[PDB]
Design an enzyme around this catalytic site. Structure first.
Site, PDB file in Angstrom:
ATOM      1  N   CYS A  29       9.003  -6.129  -2.832  1.00  0.00           N
ATOM      2  CA  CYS A  29       9.347  -5.428  -4.069  1.00  0.00           C
ATOM      3  C   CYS A  29      10.854  -5.405  -4.330  1.00  0.00           C
ATOM      4  CB  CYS A  29       8.840  -3.972  -3.999  1.00  0.00           C
ATOM      5  SG  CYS A  29       9.563  -2.958  -2.682  1.00  0.00           S
ATOM      6  N   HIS A 197       9.294   2.100  -2.977  1.00  0.00           N
ATOM      7  CA  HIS A 197       8.888   0.958  -3.781  1.00  0.00           C
ATOM      8  C   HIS A 197       9.970   0.651  -4.809  1.00  0.00           C
ATOM      9  CE1 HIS A 197       6.239  -2.028  -5.325  1.00  0.00           C
ATOM     10  NE2 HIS A 197       5.907  -1.391  -6.433  1.00  0.00           N
ATOM     11  N   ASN A 217       5.847  -2.944 -12.845  1.00  0.00           N
ATOM     12  CA  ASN A 217       5.495  -3.050 -11.436  1.00  0.00           C
ATOM     13  C   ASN A 217       5.328  -4.539 -11.169  1.00  0.00           C
ATOM     14  OD1 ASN A 217       4.789  -2.404  -8.836  1.00  0.00           O
ATOM     15  ND2 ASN A 217       3.026  -1.124  -9.384  1.00  0.00           N
TER      16      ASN A 217
HETATM   17  C1  LIG Z   1       8.518  -2.548  -1.260  1.00  0.00           C
HETATM   18  C2  LIG Z   1       7.042  -2.936  -1.440  1.00  0.00           C
HETATM   19  O1  LIG Z   1       6.760  -4.134  -1.567  1.00  0.00           O
HETATM   20  N1  LIG Z   1       6.145  -1.919  -1.447  1.00  0.00           N
HETATM   21  C3  LIG Z   1       4.659  -2.078  -1.610  1.00  0.00           C
HETATM   22  C4  LIG Z   1       3.903  -0.848  -1.029  1.00  0.00           C
HETATM   23  C5  LIG Z   1       4.381   0.507  -1.579  1.00  0.00           C
HETATM   24  O2  LIG Z   1       8.266  -2.110   1.079  1.00  0.00           O
HETATM   25  C6  LIG Z   1       9.082  -2.840   0.148  1.00  0.00           C
HETATM   26  C7  LIG Z   1      10.577  -2.453   0.306  1.00  0.00           C
HETATM   27  O3  LIG Z   1      11.437  -3.311   0.084  1.00  0.00           O
HETATM   28  N2  LIG Z   1      10.870  -1.180   0.679  1.00  0.00           N
HETATM   29  C8  LIG Z   1      12.167  -0.743   1.302  1.00  0.00           C
HETATM   30  C9  LIG Z   1      11.850  -0.284   2.801  1.00  0.00           C
HETATM   31  O4  LIG Z   1      10.882   0.492   2.941  1.00  0.00           O
HETATM   32  N3  LIG Z   1      12.568  -0.678   3.951  1.00  0.00           N
HETATM   33  C10 LIG Z   1      13.742  -1.598   3.923  1.00  0.00           C
HETATM   34  C11 LIG Z   1      14.155  -1.715   5.392  1.00  0.00           C
HETATM   35  C12 LIG Z   1      12.899  -1.303   6.180  1.00  0.00           C
HETATM   36  C13 LIG Z   1      12.234  -0.211   5.333  1.00  0.00           C
HETATM   37  C14 LIG Z   1      12.669   1.261   5.701  1.00  0.00           C
HETATM   38  O5  LIG Z   1      12.432   1.748   6.813  1.00  0.00           O
HETATM   39  O6  LIG Z   1      13.331   1.900   4.642  1.00  0.00           O
HETATM   40  C15 LIG Z   1      13.822   3.258   4.773  1.00  0.00           C
HETATM   41  C16 LIG Z   1      15.278   3.342   4.319  1.00  0.00           C
HETATM   42  C17 LIG Z   1      15.638   4.200   3.216  1.00  0.00           C
HETATM   43  C18 LIG Z   1      17.007   4.284   2.781  1.00  0.00           C
HETATM   44  C19 LIG Z   1      18.027   3.509   3.447  1.00  0.00           C
HETATM   45  C20 LIG Z   1      17.677   2.649   4.549  1.00  0.00           C
HETATM   46  C21 LIG Z   1      16.311   2.566   4.982  1.00  0.00           C
HETATM   47  C22 LIG Z   1      12.811   0.437   0.440  1.00  0.00           C
HETATM   48  C23 LIG Z   1      14.167   0.946   1.050  1.00  0.00           C
HETATM   49  C24 LIG Z   1      13.133   0.027  -1.028  1.00  0.00           C
HETATM   50  C25 LIG Z   1      12.355   0.787  -2.095  1.00  0.00           C
END
Ligand SMILES: *[C@]1(C(=O)NCCC)O[C@@H]1C(=O)N[C@H](C(=O)N1CCC[C@H]1C(=O)OCc1ccccc1)[C@@H](C)CC
Length: 251
Positions: A29, A197, A217
């Site tokens: 995403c 997301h 989306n």
């Molecule tokens: C987007 C997706 O395709 N969602 C479909 C199901 C709801 O899981 C995808 C994404 O890019 N999300 C990011 C994310 O969750 N991350 C990025 C690094 C690993 C993981 C995490 O642990 O994030 C927590 C975090 C928050 C703030 C700063 C650093 C890490 C999201 C960060 C983007 C919306």
């Protein structure tokens, strides 16, 4: 600022603004919200139409953007656009552009003629070559952004940014009740946290007194309202206004 605004109607010569993509069974995403908005902006600020490759972003940015299909960071994606640039690439199996998406479209929490999404997809390889038959070369098909920035968690500023420079990328907490969204203005009332997301915000309006953001989306068109959905605006609902990122294309 007007009470309503639809980037789709404001910029009729930029069809990417109204199209919905499908990230497939991959947590990409962050990349999709980015290439979609970047696509819109290249069109808004160059008037040329280009389907910015989600594949190039997803596979070649690397650590600077996160962990491919395992999630990434929106602002990181816009940085990659200004540093390494992005080549063109259309939908899965469209043979459009340098690098079309390589992950099959699937059914996102809905029944349809496609296979159900499995969420478990590996990040594809970063291949710096274009599909056979395409021209120019990978390096020459690169489109660079000349700035990458973050808009403040401020309703008015976010609106002004969209109003002036076009769709931006955002992110919010998805809870299970959002998965079944069909219409109206979404407001989180129940369900387990599914995680962050990243998405594309292209406008805003008011529905039955309830202010909202017009969102695109990336779960294909048979999900939600033709792939789009509306979400409560003005109260950082699910943090929808807390992580707005954008940028400007070169020249
Ligand atoms: C987007 C997706 O395709 N969602 C479909 C199901 C709801 O899981 C995808 C994404 O890019 N999300 C990011 C994310 O969750 N991350 C990025 C690094 C690993 C993981 C995490 O642990 O994030 C927590 C975090 C928050 C703030 C700063 C650093 C890490 C999201 C960060 C983007 C919306």
């Amino acid at each position: 600022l007007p009470e309503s605004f639809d980037a789709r109607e404001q910029w009729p010569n930029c069809p990417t603004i109204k199209e919905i993509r499908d990230q497939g069974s991959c947590g990409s995403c962050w990349a999709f919200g980015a290439v979609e908005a970047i696509s819109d902006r290249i069109c808004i600020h160059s008037n040329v139409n280009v389907e910015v490759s989600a594949e190039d972003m997803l596979t070649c940015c690397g650590g600077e953007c996160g962990d491919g299909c395992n999630g990434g960071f929106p602002s990181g994606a816009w940085n990659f656009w200004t540093k390494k640039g992005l080549v063109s690439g259309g939908l899965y199996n469209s043979h459009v552009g340098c690098r079309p998406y390589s992950i099959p479209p699937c059914e996102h929490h809905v029944n349809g003629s496609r296979p159900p999404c499995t969420g478990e997809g590996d990040t594809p390889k970063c291949s710096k070559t274009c599909e056979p038959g395409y021209s120019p070369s990978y390096k020459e098909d690169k489109h660079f952004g000349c700035s990458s920035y973050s808009v403040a968690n401020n309703e008015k500023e976010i609106m002004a940014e969209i109003y002036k420079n076009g769709p931006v990328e955002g992110a919010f907490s998805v809870y299970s009740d959002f998965l079944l969204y069909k219409s109206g203005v979404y407001q989180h009332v129940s369900g387990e946290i599914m995680g962050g997301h990243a998405i594309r915000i292209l406008g805003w309006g008011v529905e039955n007194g309830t202010p909202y953001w017009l969102v695109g989306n990336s779960w294909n068109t048979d999900w939600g309202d033709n792939g789009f959905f509306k979400i409560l605006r003005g109260q950082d609902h699910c943090g929808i206004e807390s992580e707005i990122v954008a940028g400007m294309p070169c020249t």
